Amino acid sequence: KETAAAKFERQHMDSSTSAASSSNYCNQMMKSRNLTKDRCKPVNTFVHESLADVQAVCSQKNVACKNGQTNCYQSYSTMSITDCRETGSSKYPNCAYKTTQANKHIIVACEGNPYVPVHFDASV
Ligand SMILES: Nc1ncnc2c1ncn2[C@@H]1O[C@H](COP(=O)(O)OP(=O)(O)O)[C@@H](OP(=O)(O)O)[C@H]1O
Secondary structure: OOOHHHHHHHHHEOOOOOOOOOOOHHHHHHHHOOOOOOOOOOEEEEEOOOHHHHHHHHHOEEEOOOOOOOOEEEOOOOEEEEEEEEOOOOEOOEOOEEEEEEEEOEEEEEEOOOOEEEEEEEEO
């Protein structure tokens, strides 16, 4: 069964490209990472940094999670990310997304031993 750490990598890690490669990046990625299987996941963020760099965020700035839990951490440095947001014309199973590249600080929730990212909370 897929662990939460493995799910995070599948849903949010894309180290192959250092930025949103094209206007069609999200359309391709949301589908290939199985994020449009059950429904069109409305929003999702991909991180273009090494896995090591992202895991290290778990020992960075401790901040409150959107859900009230306190196991969230904010990256000290900005990181290259791509936000994928479902366009109004998108209709399951024909999910469609707008691809947006940015350099922001990421906030992830971490759990376990080793302490690793399991959820993407926000970017600021
Ligand atoms: N503080 C937190 N806020 C939100 N979710 C958290 C938090 N800490 C851990 N999680 C877990 O982070 C996981 C997030 O998985 P999702 O598939 O919902 O992806 P996403 O939130 O990264 O988009 C959930 O665990 P699961 O593997 O059992 O589904 C969720 O329970």
